[PDB]
Amino acid sequence: STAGKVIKCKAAVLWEEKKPFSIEEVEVAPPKAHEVRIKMVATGICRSDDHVVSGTLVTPLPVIAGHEAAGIVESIGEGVTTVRPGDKVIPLFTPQCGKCRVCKHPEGNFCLKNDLSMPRGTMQDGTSRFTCRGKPIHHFLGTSTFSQYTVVDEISVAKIDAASPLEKVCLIGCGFSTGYGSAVKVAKVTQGSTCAVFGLGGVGLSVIMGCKAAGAARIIGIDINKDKFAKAKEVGATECVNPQDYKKPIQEVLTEMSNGGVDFSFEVIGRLDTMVTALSCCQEAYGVSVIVGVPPDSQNLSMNPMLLLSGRTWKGAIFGGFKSKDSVPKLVADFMAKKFALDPLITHVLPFEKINEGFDLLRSGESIRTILTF
Amino acid sequence: STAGKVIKCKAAVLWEEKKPFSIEEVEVAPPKAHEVRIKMVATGICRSDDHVVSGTLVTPLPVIAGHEAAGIVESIGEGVTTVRPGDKVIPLFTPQCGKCRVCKHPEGNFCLKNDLSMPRGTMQDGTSRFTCRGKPIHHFLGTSTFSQYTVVDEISVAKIDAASPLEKVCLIGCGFSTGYGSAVKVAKVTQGSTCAVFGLGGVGLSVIMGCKAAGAARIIGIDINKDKFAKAKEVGATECVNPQDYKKPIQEVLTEMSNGGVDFSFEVIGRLDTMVTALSCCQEAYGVSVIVGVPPDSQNLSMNPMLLLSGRTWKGAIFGGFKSKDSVPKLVADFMAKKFALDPLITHVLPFEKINEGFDLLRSGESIRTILTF
Numbered sequence: 001s002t003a004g005k006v007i008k009c010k011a012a013v014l015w016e017e018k019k020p021f022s023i024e025e026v027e028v029a030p031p032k033a034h035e036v037r038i039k040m041v042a043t044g045i046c047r048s049d050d051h052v053v054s055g056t057l058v059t060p061l062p063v064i065a066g067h068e069a070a071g072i073v074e075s076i077g078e079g080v081t082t083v084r085p086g087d088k089v090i091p092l093f094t095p096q097c098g099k100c101r102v103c104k105h106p107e108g109n110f111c112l113k114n115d116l117s118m119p120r121g122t123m124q125d126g127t128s129r130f131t132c133r134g135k136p137i138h139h140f141l142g143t144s145t146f147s148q149y150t151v152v153d154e155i156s157v158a159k160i161d162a163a164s165p166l167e168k169v170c171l172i173g174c175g176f177s178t179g180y181g182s183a184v185k186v187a188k189v190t191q192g193s194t195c196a197v198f199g200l201g202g203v204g205l206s207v208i209m210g211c212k213a214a215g216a217a218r219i220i221g222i223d224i225n226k227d228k229f230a231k232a233k234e235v236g237a238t239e240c241v242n243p244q245d246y247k248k249p250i251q252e253v254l255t256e257m258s259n260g261g262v263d264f265s266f267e268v269i270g271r272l273d274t275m276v277t278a279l280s281c282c283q284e285a286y287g288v289s290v291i292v293g294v295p296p297d298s299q300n301l302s303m304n305p306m307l308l309l310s311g312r313t314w315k316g317a318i319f320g321g322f323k324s325k326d327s328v329p330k331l332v333a334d335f336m337a338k339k340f341a342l343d344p345l346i347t348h349v350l351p352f353e354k355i356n357e358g359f360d361l362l363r364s365g366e367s368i369r370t371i372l373t374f
Numbered sequence: 375s376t377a378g379k380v381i382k383c384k385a386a387v388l389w390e391e392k393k394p395f396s397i398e399e400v401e402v403a404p405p406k407a408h409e410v411r412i413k414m415v416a417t418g419i420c421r422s423d424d425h426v427v428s429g430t431l432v433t434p435l436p437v438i439a440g441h442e443a444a445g446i447v448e449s450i451g452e453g454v455t456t457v458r459p460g461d462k463v464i465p466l467f468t469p470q471c472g473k474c475r476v477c478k479h480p481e482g483n484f485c486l487k488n489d490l491s492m493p494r495g496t497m498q499d500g501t502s503r504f505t506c507r508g509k510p511i512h513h514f515l516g517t518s519t520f521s522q523y524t525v526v527d528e529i530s531v532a533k534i535d536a537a538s539p540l541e542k543v544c545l546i547g548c549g550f551s552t553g554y555g556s557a558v559k560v561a562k563v564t565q566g567s568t569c570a571v572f573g574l575g576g577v578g579l580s581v582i583m584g585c586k587a588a589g590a591a592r593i594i595g596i597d598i599n600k601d602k603f604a605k606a607k608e609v610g611a612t613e614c615v616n617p618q619d620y621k622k623p624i625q626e627v628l629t630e631m632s633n634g635g636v637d638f639s640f641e642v643i644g645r646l647d648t649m650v651t652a653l654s655c656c657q658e659a660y661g662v663s664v665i666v667g668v669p670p671d672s673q674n675l676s677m678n679p680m681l682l683l684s685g686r687t688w689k690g691a692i693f694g695g696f697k698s699k700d701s702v703p704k705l706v707a708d709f710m711a712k713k714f715a716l717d718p719l720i721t722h723v724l725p726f727e728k729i730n731e732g733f734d735l736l737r738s739g740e741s742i743r744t745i746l747t748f
């Protein structure tokens with residue numbers, strides 16, 4: 001039995017920015033009250049994890065990163081009611097405490113208990129469950145999924161279908177749900193509309209899936225890497241454009257293509273310039289633009305507010321706008337009912353021990369999602 | 375007797391920026407096909423007219439400004455079907471051609487025939503109906519209401535109730551409808567919500583009216599001129615704050631007052647800094663901020679897009695989001711049925727000949743709306 005005991009296991013520790021992960025033994029404390037210890041089964045490599053490595057996202061180091069995953073409950077602390085040992089679960093990088101003003105709001109999902117805005121890199125109680133070489137190691141977004149075992153707060157975990165394939169549904173923990181919800185819930189894409197999707201990685205592909213599901217008539221994919229176009233078309237893009245092919249700015253190209261601007265645009269990269277371009281290419285009177293990408297820490301964009309005064313709507317969201325604990329189980333149920341596909345997003349499946357190679361595939365432009373299996 | 379003939383009348387011509395208007399004789403050509411010549415009865419002095427004088431708003435000079443008005447049709451050009459001589463009318467600074475993609479869109483109101491985005495200062499045909507001292511004089515927004523007679527395109531005029539009091543309902547041509555619609559139509563303020571209104575002039579007062587009509591529980595007015603607070607409370611503000619009273623930035627004050635951010639905020643001034651402050655003070659996960667004020671020409675704001683990524687919505691609108699020709703007559707009908715009040719906005723009345731004194735009153739901070747009578 002491991003319940004109630006410290007577990008020694010393998011994890012990928014990030015000791016400092018711009019260095020490879022170190023795959024080594026960590027100690028994982030047992031869960032305290034209202035905490036859940038999970039044996040990880042699969043975790044995805046998301047660009048946001050690379051942002052921690054690159055310094056694009058600032059979070060306390062050293063750290064166990066990883067936020068898109070699925071696993072099986074090993075043990076629960078006192079007072080846990082929503083999961084039991086043996087349950088399949090997805091950690092929730094956006095929690096759902098159910099009690100704060102956001103949780104109670106019909107349209108908010110960015111629960112005030114989150115560790116995104118002002119990250120401490122701890123459990124809710126302000127302490128860490130991880131040690132490595134005698135040193136405390138930080139958590140990441142309350143999830144820390146780059147470990148054979150993690151500990152999460154109960155508000156940061158959802159129980160899912162016991163028959164779920166964990167090596168696929170881990171994507172519901174971040175990239176699929178984020179893109180899909182950005183289209184269907186946040187933008188509320190309409191039937192017959194024209195959509196523009198900037199960035200054709202895992203998240204942008206999921207935005208395309210949602211735009212197609214919503215009945216868009218035209219879905220224009222934009223990426224500087226033309227190797228991304230074939231898969232974008234497979235999942236619903238009607239056209240793809242590479243800005244590097246044009247003498248004019250791409251907002252002008254897209255405005256012309258759409259006979260005066262698109263209905264919905266999405267920034268799914270993380271660049272300040274593309275955020276402004278995406279806003280500009282939506283129709284000036286009634287267009288909607290959604291920011292999904294995460295830009296470099298503490299950098300401001302510059303824009304002319306006449307873009308908004310004419311009638312545009314500009315919004316952003318975390319996790320597709322989904323209230324996390326309510327939505328994850330339903331998304332998995334919908335996947336099990338064949339309502340959407342996840343295989344198009346998965347280009348590589350590697351053992352966990354190859355985490356660095358998986359990040360190199362992302363950085364080189366060669367992968368969409370690599371799933372790491374424990 | 376004047377139908378088909380040039381009319382000589384008095385208008386207020388702006389020859390140069392940063393100068394008084396010159397009340398002098400102009401020649402007003404008869405209406406061409408699909409044009410309407412209107413005898414003006416009353417026109418309001420709106421801050422946007424002042425922006426033309428100050429250079430905040432760039433439009434070709436020399437010009438006959440004025441855009442908030444009501445009058446009586448003197449004559450119609452060939453092919454006009456929607457008004458007749460003797461009808462009471464409001465000129466529409468935002469046209470409604472009824473044929474473009476925006477006019478056909480359920481939400482859009484910024485008709486593509488507008489003369490706001492890239493002002494030419496002409497009729498729809500690219501020519502002027504005004505001569506002064508033998509020189510052609512520009513139109514403004516297709517309306518040019520600072521004249522005893524103007525000529526407008528048919529898509530820029532609405533017929534209104536024959537019993538309408540024109541010295542009141544001119545405010546439906548801009549300031550009332552813009553602020554009211556910004557709350558009820560653009561923001562879609564909800565019952566029980568907390569609203570923050572930056573700027574307590576005529577437009578911001580109208581926003582407050584709209585927020586109160588929509589059922590807001592708290593309406594916080596923000597102005598650096600505390601003389602504006604008594605009327606703001608009369609029309610529905612629950613509390614007023616002056617940024618100059620505080621050591622902390624007002625977005626922090628408002629976030630504290632609203633226990634974590636407001637539901638709806640409105641920028642009703644025209645400053646880049648207050649546009650960002652207004653966005654910041656709405657709740658980070660589900661807040662909505664609407665830009666109403668007109669900022670200085672060609673200037674960009676700087677902002678951190680993480681404000682949006684957490685869930686905020688940022689939008690702007692012209693004329694309260696109202697499709698102009700459909701909406702203006704209905705708004706007048708609702709006024710005649712006492713569904714809203716206009717008298718709280720009217721602080722001064724002057725003859726047209728005292729236009730410069732009217733502008734002095736606005737610039738000093740003393741007036742809300744001065745109504746000029748012809």
Ligand SMILES: NC(=O)c1ccc[n+]([C@@H]2O[C@H](COP(=O)([O-])OP(=O)([O-])OC[C@H]3O[C@@H](n4cnc5c(N)[nH+]cnc54)[C@H](O)[C@@H]3O)[C@@H](O)[C@H]2O)c1
Pocket residue numbers: 046047048051174175178198199200201202203204222223224225228243268269270271274291292293294295317318319320365368683
């Ligand atoms: N809002 C959320 O909740 C949330 C969740 C998940 C991911 N993210 C962010 O979303 C973004 C996309 O993540 P991902 O899909 O995993 O990343 P990814 O797989 O790296 O995809 C990004 C795509 O952008 C393309 N690209 C780069 N520069 C440009 C350019 N100038 N113009 C057009 N295309 C360009 C690039 O070739 C690539 O295909 C990242 O910034 C993530 O951090 C946000």
Ligand SMILES: NC(=O)c1ccc[n+]([C@@H]2O[C@H](COP(=O)([O-])OP(=O)([O-])OC[C@H]3O[C@@H](n4cnc5c(N)[nH+]cnc54)[C@H](O)[C@@H]3O)[C@@H](O)[C@H]2O)c1
Pocket residue numbers: 309420421422425548549552572573574575576577578596597598599602617642643644645648665666667668669691692693694742
């Ligand atoms: N979007 C539209 O369709 C539309 C139509 C009508 C008016 N406008 C614009 O709306 C704005 C307001 O017009 P208005 O109500 O006639 O103008 P106004 O009567 O000048 O009112 C502006 C108010 O802002 C106050 N103010 C100035 N600076 C600050 C500050 N830093 N903080 C807080 N309050 C401050 C000022 O004291 C005044 O009471 C102007 O920019 C107009 O050009 C836009």
Ligand SMILES: OCc1c(F)c(F)c(F)c(F)c1F
Pocket residue numbers: 046048049057067093116141174294318319683
């Ligand atoms: O990919 C999801 C994701 C985000 F959207 C962020 F805004 C963030 F800061 C982060 F760490 C993260 F993992």
Ligand SMILES: OCc1c(F)c(F)c(F)c(F)c1F
Pocket residue numbers: 309420422423431441467490515548668692693
């Ligand atoms: O007051 C209404 C109004 C506007 F909202 C503008 F954006 C504009 F450019 C203008 F000239 C105007 F009069």
Ligand SMILES: [Zn+2]
Pocket residue numbers: 095096097098099100101102103111112113
């Ligand atoms: Zn919460």
Ligand SMILES: [Zn+2]
Pocket residue numbers: 046047048049067068174175
């Ligand atoms: Zn992610």
Ligand SMILES: [Zn+2]
Pocket residue numbers: 469470471472473474475476477485486487
């Ligand atoms: Zn139109």
Ligand SMILES: [Zn+2]
Pocket residue numbers: 420421422423441442548549
């Ligand atoms: Zn105005």
